[PDB]
Amino acid sequence: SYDRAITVFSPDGHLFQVEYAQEAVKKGSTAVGVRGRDIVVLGVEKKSVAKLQDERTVRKICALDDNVCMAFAGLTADARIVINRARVECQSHRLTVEDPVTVEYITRYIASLKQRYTQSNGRRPFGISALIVGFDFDGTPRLYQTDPSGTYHAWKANAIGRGAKSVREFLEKNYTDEAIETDDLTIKLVIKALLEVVQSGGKNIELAVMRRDQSLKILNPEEIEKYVAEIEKEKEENE
Amino acid sequence: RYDSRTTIFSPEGRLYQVEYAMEAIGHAGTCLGILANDGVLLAAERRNIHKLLDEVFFSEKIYKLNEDMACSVAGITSDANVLTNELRLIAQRYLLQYQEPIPCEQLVTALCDIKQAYTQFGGKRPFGVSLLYIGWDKHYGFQLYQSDPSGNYGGWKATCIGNNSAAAVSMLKQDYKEGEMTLKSALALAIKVLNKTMDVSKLSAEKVEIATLTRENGKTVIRVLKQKEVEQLIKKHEEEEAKAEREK
Amino acid sequence: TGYDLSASTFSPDGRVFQVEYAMKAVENSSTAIGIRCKDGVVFGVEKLVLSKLYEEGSNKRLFNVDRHVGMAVAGLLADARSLADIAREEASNFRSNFGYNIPLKHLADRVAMYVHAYTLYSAVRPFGCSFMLGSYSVNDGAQLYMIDPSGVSYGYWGCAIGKARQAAKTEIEKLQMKEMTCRDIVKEVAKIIYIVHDEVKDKAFELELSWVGELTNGRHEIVPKDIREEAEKYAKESLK
Amino acid sequence: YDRGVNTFSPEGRLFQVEYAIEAIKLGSTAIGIQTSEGVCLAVEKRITSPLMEPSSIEKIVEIDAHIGCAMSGLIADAKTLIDKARVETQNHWFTYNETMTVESVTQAVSNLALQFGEEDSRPFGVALLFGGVDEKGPQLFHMDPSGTFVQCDARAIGSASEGAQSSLQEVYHKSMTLKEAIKSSLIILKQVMEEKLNATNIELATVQPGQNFHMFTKEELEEVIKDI
Amino acid sequence: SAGFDRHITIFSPEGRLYQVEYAFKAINQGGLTSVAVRGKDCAVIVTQKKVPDKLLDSSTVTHLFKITENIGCVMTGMTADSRSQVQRARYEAANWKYKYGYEIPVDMLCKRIADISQVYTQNAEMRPLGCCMILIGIDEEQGPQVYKCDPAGYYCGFKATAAGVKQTESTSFLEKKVKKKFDWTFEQTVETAITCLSTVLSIDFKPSEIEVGVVTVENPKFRILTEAEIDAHLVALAE
Amino acid sequence: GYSFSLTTFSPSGKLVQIEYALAAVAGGAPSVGIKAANGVVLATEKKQKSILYDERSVHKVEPITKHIGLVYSGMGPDYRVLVHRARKLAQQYYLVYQEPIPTAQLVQRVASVMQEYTQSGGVRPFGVSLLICGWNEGRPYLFQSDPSGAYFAWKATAMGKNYVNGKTFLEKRYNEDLELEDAIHTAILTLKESFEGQMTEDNIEVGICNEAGFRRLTPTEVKDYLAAIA
Amino acid sequence: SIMSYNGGAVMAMKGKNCVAIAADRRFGIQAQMVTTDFQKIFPMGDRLYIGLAGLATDVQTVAQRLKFRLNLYELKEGRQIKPYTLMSMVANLLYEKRFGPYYTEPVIAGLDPKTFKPFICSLDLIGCPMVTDDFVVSGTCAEQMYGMCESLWEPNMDPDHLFETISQAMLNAVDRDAVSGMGVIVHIIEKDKITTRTLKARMD
Amino acid sequence: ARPDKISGADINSICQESGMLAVRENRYIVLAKDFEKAYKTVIKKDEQEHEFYK
Amino acid sequence: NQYDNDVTVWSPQGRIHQIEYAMEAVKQGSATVGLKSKTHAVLVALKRAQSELAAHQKKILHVDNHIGISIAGLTADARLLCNFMRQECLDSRFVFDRPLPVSRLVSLIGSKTQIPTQRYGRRPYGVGLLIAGYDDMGPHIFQTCPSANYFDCRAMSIGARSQSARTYLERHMSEFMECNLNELVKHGLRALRETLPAEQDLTTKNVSIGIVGKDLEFTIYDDDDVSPFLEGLEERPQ
């Protein structure tokens, strides 16, 4: 019983820092991710270019292997350390059994490390929640999410960061059965998610794709302008 | 209320010591580096300008770290020595392992991880020091970076130190330059920034410090320049002030 | 007081309350005395049965560390057992490394340093024990020692550890200790234990007598107290 | 006060273990019933979103080919304990060419269910139900965070366990049959749950001595649901 | 002031620390008086006993502790710290004799004991040895020496020396007494020691209370005096 | 009641258990050191508490090598520990390089030692500020450090009681170019400015640093010089 | 021998106001050569070279280790290194492997940083320094170079005669040598400039 | 030379202790032992004093 | 009351309240009674349950061929000391190839439990051992405590409301010594039936009896050799 420390329970059976460390994620930048049937795609919002510096270093979407893709929320330093560890874990797994690394094993690694990191004596838990997207077994699209407690939790679409309830609520009203594939409709689905974002500034949108066989492709802020134009065309056709 | 250690969180989730480390940063020396191709610069303000020193070190904030990189520094001064010896050791380990100069980004992330390991672990004092980066590589050319006690690092082209440099960043945005790689132009711009931002009346050269880094034919030399060109830079900038009062 | 928590801190007047609280903890324990004669050392402990649940021969505070050295402890019993084990270990090491019997002063100094080191640090408490050390040697005679909870260890002729610490040595010092053999000192210790606290606060007690000296040829053991039965036929004559 | 695992109460007791027993209560419910025909077992999933894939959340896991499990509380402490049991079972088969019986499984788990210690970490926050078939027929086993392990004939855990045990002792006797106990359990489930019972809410795990393999029911559970 | 409740060894405001200067009267819980005298090629220690008891012995009560065959010392304060410091001094003098091949000078031992007390002071979490040690010794080419060791770790060494309980007065008398430039032909030293303690305490007592520790450049062996010769000196100073 | 102890920052300021250590340093014995053109002169202020104490036992001016002097203003028992550290460390340098260690390198490593002791959180820092000097490569140097692990370089400075007044006098009286003897004169002047007046061959203790090496002067030449030097 | 596994020959000769260092070019296994461009003379700062002969693995590893400690020393202290400092550093680096020794014979050749004072020294495989004034040699062939350099050296030598003397000595001693050959690199340095020449050797 | 911690009101009381002790001496003469008793009586805890760490 | 938190801190009255709190934690266990004859040592405990469907928690557990223990208090420390007990048995069984004397075993138990009562970082063990064994001098009934002051007796009883059991031992400790096994065991349960409230009766499923003899190996029983021991009784004198 108190917000210190991590080790003792509440008198009604809670952990304060486990519950409180998710708030740092919940005040963090928004990053969504869906799975198609063949091409999986995701993206972050709030690029927030401050007019005088470069932004190629602030990239919140990366990869550990050619088959898996990353995202996170919360603070950036824990994401840096966890991904730098996870690359070496992926490569050590590759040094073992010669398969491409399954998404399930590396999510069990990351959440397990995060949890046994939390259980120890006075280590501040990683206030992040990762998005781990891959299509490995005959191109079966999978995306799991993490938690500061360290619970991998398999979804079909995902939304975190600021206002994640509303952004996930849009996918409730959007995600019918016949999404994909239909890759173009998955493209427009990512575009409608970016239009349903908390700010949807139009130029602060950064999205990355994976066709389950190719590499990670960073798009261009003219294709997305065409996507916003055809989405506004669909809104006018609704009228 | 929920103060005591660096670890664990305060319930927001916010932090205590990262914020207080930045507020430790703000009351320190002001430095800057500028947008320049074919070279890059560093500026620094002389703390403790009392007359009974020696200045036989030639360098008080600048540390020519590997061959082609220097670093300004700001904050608690002995922790800067602690980090700079280790950072030279990291760069020299990289050179030992590969026989190639370090391309500066993994160097920056390595130092950020060194700082971050003291952010998570407990109970240790995190380094209340931000510090700059100039350097050259085989992949991007001249570069600029901003280290932070959080472990976050920013690739800038016009950098930021604390309360004595928020107005400097405001002047850097309002007087932004792009396209001119002429180093004397950026040196005059930095002279203007330290003329307004420092409270030194008429900008005595003993209170300033300027170091540059140019690419010469294979060598990538670092120029800790002397005082007389600083003197004529001051006279040039004050002639530009006379040009400014031509509108009266 | 307050200011009384850790064993490493001092007081604003300069003493350690942990040492003091460890000292007066043994004050509540049972009375244990000792006295030597000109050719031996006699122990004796006022030991109490709880109500009817004991067995008269359990948990005897008269230990026996070495062939010629044994303890007469009082205080916390398990702490005394642990300290007895450390004494046995030290006597074993001396016997291993030097090939003869441990002199009692050196043994007392090593045990006193062990006690003192357990008074030094803050993670451990001071001991809650106070005990006796008796010995005999043909080249050294009888030596009777005494160890406080702090670690101040020096010698006596006679001692008492328990409630009636003052009230025993009130009349121990009127014993003519030098000119007597220890077989007289047996019934002396019997009358000393028997005079203090016959029936007052508690119900019943029980006597043990340890015994080392020239008569045992360097052995240290409990008397055959039942043999010659020195207490009760004198105790019934010591009530008048 | 009570502030840590290294301090008793003036009357008892921990006062950390008590808060772990309190932290049992937050979880979803689960019910297992021992029948000599075989051990049946059930759980609620408590699905939040339609995006939340139902077969991904694990409640019944497989430790041995004839040993099931069910978890109640913190997911990751349970995952650690399942990991250790999965290791230890295999070591027992390794060193003995035989199956570790489920009571001995539970002794092995409860050896460090309380080995909690930060120096010389915290106690765990999950209660576990073990179902299996040893040589003596089927076995149903109930442990706790405090390691006080005992056999139970039909134990219910988690939230709303009081009326679950009440209506369970209302309906239970020693000579039950299989499908009767299955429907009797799912009646109590749809009495303690808040949502409409369907194919995604619950899942069953049935182990039999002649049907040792596949301690699970997949979409025939729909047919079991529609018979009420 | 405090304020900080001075629990552990930290710096209090303006500017002091209180643990060691509480340990300065851990000597004063001893209830004892110690006097050292260096005038000429002899050196004299004197210190009383406090024995109220007839059941208590007389040989084992001595605080004159022979460190080595040419180095003796005397202790005050609480007895356990004193005896522990004595065994440490014995062990380190033996280590000197093993390593360096010759008998240790008296100064180096004081330096080592001061270093041990400083290390116990520098690092926390150990009680800092509240006992004061006074050393004497003969050195070649330097004559006699007297040194004092603090619990504070500040060793010093000088001619007329005293520590214990009542030695502000003893140092006052030795300021008034060692100012006249008389020679010290060893009975002068015995007389000044006995009379300075006999003016501080003003008891003029039996030869059975004080212990006299001497060392002289005619036999550099440390020497403890006997009852008969103490009585001989006492009636020799009786006028 | 905060800071307490060594693991956290303040809400806005600096480290209180460094500031109080500096306060205990400033509450120390006065001293002065002056870098001249040819040598550097160090001198202290050493009054015995009584007339009993001996002045051939404890020594303030202390050599680290044959060409490096070093004094302090603070607490002796910590002073000896860090000096012994510097001794062993300079000998390790002479083992590795077979060459006498430069004073800047000593200041680097001693500063690293002290900064390591200011690292969190179980020991206190030193109550010791240093004055390091030596005639390395012709040009003499003068290096003052502090318990925070930092260091400086002075022409002339002081440490102890009334160091601000001594500093104003050294700003006033001293200048860049003097000799060793003139530096000795103004050093005894600025020491006698703030000390008590009863100053003999024993109350002060002076070591100099020639280009011929370190030299720790004797009371013979001290009473030869300080017998009413002005 | 183990020293005669990859061959090797390093000659240094002290002139009047300058110093010259030369080595062979051949690299290969015991009788089978591989290449003609193997570096054994490494620049360590300005106007200060080092020569390494013996086992090539120890040569490259010791050269990189010395480069490591050299850069750390010259970046802790902004001045450049004196040659005696280098000699003590190399002796320490070798003597750390007292019982695990590297198999090399380092030769240091450099000038004074302040004056133009020349300097030569050579070391053993455990770190025994030795300063002379005429010449030091190392490698598999020894006695040939000893005879030639004791035959042709004069105390005060203009850089042209120093160059030609070390040229003829190296060429004749390498042509008598079997396992080391295939071209000669020559470094002649001085206060003004650094001259590097390659000689037309017998490629047999 | 004995610090610190003398207040101004204490001097005259020390002088009174010394003078009335000399009245008990039945002499008008102020010796040092008068000041000894005066220091020991009117100082009035604490004191040791010092000479450690300066 | 700020000093009543930790094991290391002495009280200003000198009584470590951590020890007495461990004693009170021991007093909340089950009832059990141990008593010996000259030839046969029998310890009898009481079982309890979580629910009606649940099994009964066993108390008497096997240790060795001539050693068996009762228990009251914590269960993790119970199995911890069980593992240590079995280890100390089989170690000397391996080295000396003899069965142990019981006294040195229980001294090892006290020395094992001393360190978690003196240093900081581990709580004292809430433990209720009653140990029955056979050395060369016959049966022994020892009892333990969290203060590691192990007691030798002839008849003890610890747990909740064990005082009536102790008075029964008082009024039959003269009678225990001569009888054979059967009425000795029914004396034991004529202590356990007074460790209960009188509005219910001691059943089968709640009791276990362990006999070790000078020629008989230590054996635990449950309902089946106990239904023979449960006959031969009268009702309580209501």
Place this chain on the structure above:
Amino acid sequence: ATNRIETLDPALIRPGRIDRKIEFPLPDEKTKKRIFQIHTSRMTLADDVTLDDLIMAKDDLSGADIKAICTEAGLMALRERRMKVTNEDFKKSKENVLYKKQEGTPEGLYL
């Protein structure tokens, strides 16, 4: 009426005392327009803006947001001595009100 609810007596939120606990969440992004309508119902304004531009700006919504927007727009109006408030007043008012105050905390954290 409270801001937080977690630090309150469970004996005071029980019924008998209080029978109608009432949630105030920040309700919806649609009635943002109703508060912009009401708080500009009696001030002359041009068309020149869409409230959707002030719907897709910030994720937490309040009358404390919208009334601050209105008052700062009036400050920018009397700053530029106009009426019939145009779009640039809304844009600068938007940015200055979202900054003052909602950000948290100095960079960075998070980002």
